[PDB]
Design a protein around this ligand. Sequence first.
Ligand SMILES: Nc1ncnc2c1ncn2[C@@H]1O[C@H](CO)[C@@H](O)[C@H]1O
Ligand SMILES: Nc1ncnc2c1ncn2[C@@H]1O[C@H](CO)[C@@H](O)[C@H]1O
Ligand SMILES: N[C@@H](CCCC[NH3+])C(=O)O
Ligand SMILES: N[C@@H](CCCC[NH3+])C(=O)O
Ligand code: NA
Lengths: 502, 499
Amino acid sequence: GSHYTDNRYKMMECIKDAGRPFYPHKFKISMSLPAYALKYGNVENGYIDKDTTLSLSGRVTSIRSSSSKLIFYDIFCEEQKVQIIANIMEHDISTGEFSVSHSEIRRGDVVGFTGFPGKSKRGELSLFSKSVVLLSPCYHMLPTAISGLKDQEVRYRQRYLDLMLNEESRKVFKLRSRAIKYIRNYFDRLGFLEVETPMLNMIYGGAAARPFITYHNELETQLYMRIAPELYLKQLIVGGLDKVYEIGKNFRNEGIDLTHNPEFTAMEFYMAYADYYDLMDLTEELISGLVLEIHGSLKIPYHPDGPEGKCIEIDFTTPWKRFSFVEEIESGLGEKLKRPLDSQENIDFMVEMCEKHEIELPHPRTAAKLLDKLAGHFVETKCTNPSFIIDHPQTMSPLAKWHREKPEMTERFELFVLGKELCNAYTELNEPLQQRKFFEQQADAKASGDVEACPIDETFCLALEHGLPPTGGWGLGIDRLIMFLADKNNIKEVILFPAMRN
Amino acid sequence: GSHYTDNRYKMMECIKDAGRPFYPHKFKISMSLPAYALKYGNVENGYIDKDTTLSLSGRVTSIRSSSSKLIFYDIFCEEQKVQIIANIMEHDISTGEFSVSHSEIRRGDVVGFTGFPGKSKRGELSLFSKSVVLLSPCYHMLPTAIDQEVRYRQRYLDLMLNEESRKVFKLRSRAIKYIRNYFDRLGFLEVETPMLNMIYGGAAARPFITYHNELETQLYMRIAPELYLKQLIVGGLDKVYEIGKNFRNEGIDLTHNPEFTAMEFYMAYADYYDLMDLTEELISGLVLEIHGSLKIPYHPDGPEGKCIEIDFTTPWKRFSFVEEIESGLGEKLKRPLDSQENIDFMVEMCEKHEIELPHPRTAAKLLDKLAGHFVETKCTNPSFIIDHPQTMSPLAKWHREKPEMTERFELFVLGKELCNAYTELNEPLQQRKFFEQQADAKASGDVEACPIDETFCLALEHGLPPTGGWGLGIDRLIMFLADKNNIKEVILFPAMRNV
Ligand SMILES: Nc1ncnc2c1ncn2[C@@H]1O[C@H](CO)[C@@H](O)[C@H]1O
Ligand SMILES: Nc1ncnc2c1ncn2[C@@H]1O[C@H](CO)[C@@H](O)[C@H]1O
Ligand SMILES: N[C@@H](CCCC[NH3+])C(=O)O
Ligand SMILES: N[C@@H](CCCC[NH3+])C(=O)O
Ligand code: NA
């Protein structure tokens, strides 16, 4: 273990001081291993083309010697295995003695080979080699599969080992790229403009979340990492860009669990002249289209307790169920909330309902945070298949436009799948007096200890005074989307280098 | 100004109290204004189709009340202007008296109209309207055209009034699309790596510091994704790229924003010679795609000032880092380059040639000051500065021929850095040594030196294939492609001095 690494360093010093190849700068491959298998994988058993000399490279996954004169390697690269057959009779002595050249190679090394293409008589796609070059040794004894690792935290703390040994991990990150490409294409075809807005701002906003705080030395100002791009994106709609989207990181200074990482990939878009009814239809079309693209149908498998557990089916057939926020809470309680929803009477009532139903109280005990706890208990738990929770109270939705029919509510929805939030969207509040009033209420909540409440943003109120058209905006948690598409129940599976405790 | 805003708020309260339309939730347009122009733009002068009623919407850019009976509007939306002709004889009185309905509208308002399509007798694409609805008022008197700091602090005003600024950000998207497509077609995988970490590295920069409360852990924002991306090549992904923000806690100027958009890629089995060829092919292709030529204009002092020509014709000029410094000095640096003797000699040379001294006076920072004076100033056209000393390139592999150098290049255009790339150091003993020298420099007062990254050293012990890696400043690229001399012109919401 420790001896192996020590001895490997001693081998490499011996190599270097014997004048032999020590970390060559450039190895010119003739073709990739996938290209090699495509070209030669169908030749007849025993075929060899001695008129063609080719250079290949990969990581050694197997070494065996059938005799003093014959060594078999497997190398692996870009998802393809190729066997190397090294016969002493073909060895190029200008590269050194056969036994010396091969004594330097270990399983796990990155190596190059040169030789003739073909297939062993037993039918294995092979390179019949004349030389071997150690390109980058592995100083550690590697397992053959991710089951041979010390802990399964190793997969996350040393992701290169997961990627090296586990095809399923590599497939996840290819699917991640494929899904994001689909999303960009969907919005590009609709005429959207992709933009980038600041991740560092003098004032945070646009979501219910605690920020990271930092400092810019030369400007002598504190800054926040963005919890959401919403307030900048809406200024672009004031500016006339009509259809914009942004895909990138949000940063939320909060706990880590199966569906939360402190930095995560999200998307928002803003579409002038849409309302939240339009956005519900678009969400159904976009997500069902993507599910269909990946899976071939709208009913897809999910293993909620890991792949050693049961398999359930998530049904993305549209249209999806709607749950109205307050009505579904009241159905769960068997009685109505007090009105106004943000009155002291209803706040006291909701505290007593949380205690009655053994729901842990938020702090501070604002109407918005109490409504959120009740929704999490009574409504989010009903959302197995994709389901919209709609018409959230204004008191918990400071940037959402008042509902055109329902007093105290907003034109808002959240999309939930398997009880977890995927999307958040609304008809955008574009009336500046109300916007300032709700910002003031947020700032009061922040001063009272609500770390997820946001300060007043004067620059944003001034932007609204220049005229935000009727607009619909929308956000999606891309990592959570990948969790469902790839059938992973831990967000650490879909993020290359996730945050780890300790 | 102040009175106008307050009076507009009073108008809106009067509208609300009269039960008149107050911020309607949904206006259903019949078609976009560009679609409207495409459909009716070629009809004969004076054409009107009173059998077709359409709804259109935009921002009011002009109001001409020619008479008590007739009002002309221009509305603007999605880059298309349409004239609205509002005749009292067509007014739908169920929406209010004609004078009342139009009294509520001002230039700058977002409005909807419904009416008949056609063209005025004078030949203007028009809507002959029957109604008007105030969708979202503007509470401020707007100029007719673009401090000019207002363009940066209130970017919506720049976008609203200045087509040139909208064009810049469409070009920015077009260029990034071209870049993604170039690497996608080569079989690259786009990845995302952490912007928040317990350590910082991969470049020479002071980091931003933050804190995760639940984990009770101080964190740094990334100054570069380099060390994570190389771990993915150890992992076998072979060809990866990332496009996104870096964060560097340093001064702002015409080419520096504290957050900026960068791209890095890592290609197993490439060396820096391969990366030079790829850089030429990628960038010259993009320039050709946007401009139709490899020779493009640039205005270093603004669009009314002098214009120069940047020539992207291949192959580009190479400058060897040390040789060019020595040609400028007319004498040779002392060896080893990181000896105390050469540090003192480079200090003497800076004083001789009136170059401002770095702090601290490390060999790497002195060499950088000398290169900036004697070499970077020669790079008007795209030019590669190559073979940087190891002492300033702790992650670049030793040069296969030149002692003390590395297989590194930087791409400079108009004296400004655009790319940084090298054959990657994949030998772990040397890597630790150079990390230790960096840690010593940081302990000696170099705030741009990085701590030792043990997780990266351990990753190298698992075998990084020979690899070439590369970075590009996207914002600076857009500056040249779009002909802007200030990075604030290519970033939607740039950092501004707080005063
Ligand atoms: N900490 C988090 N980690 C991952 N995804 C999150 C987190 N918080 C919220 N989300 C998702 O991102 C969206 C907001 O950016 C939410 O609607 C949800 O889907
Ligand atoms: N502060 C900065 N602002 C903008 N671009 C930068 C900054 N620092 C470096 N760059 C560019 O980004 C690359 C590194 O990410 C550099 O090669 C350079 O082109
Ligand atoms: N900013 C929201 C998403 C957009 C909501 C609609 N404007 C969030 O972080 O969840
Ligand atoms: N990390 C470098 C770019 C890549 C250099 C090659 N590995 C920078 O920030 O300049
Ligand atoms: Na359907």
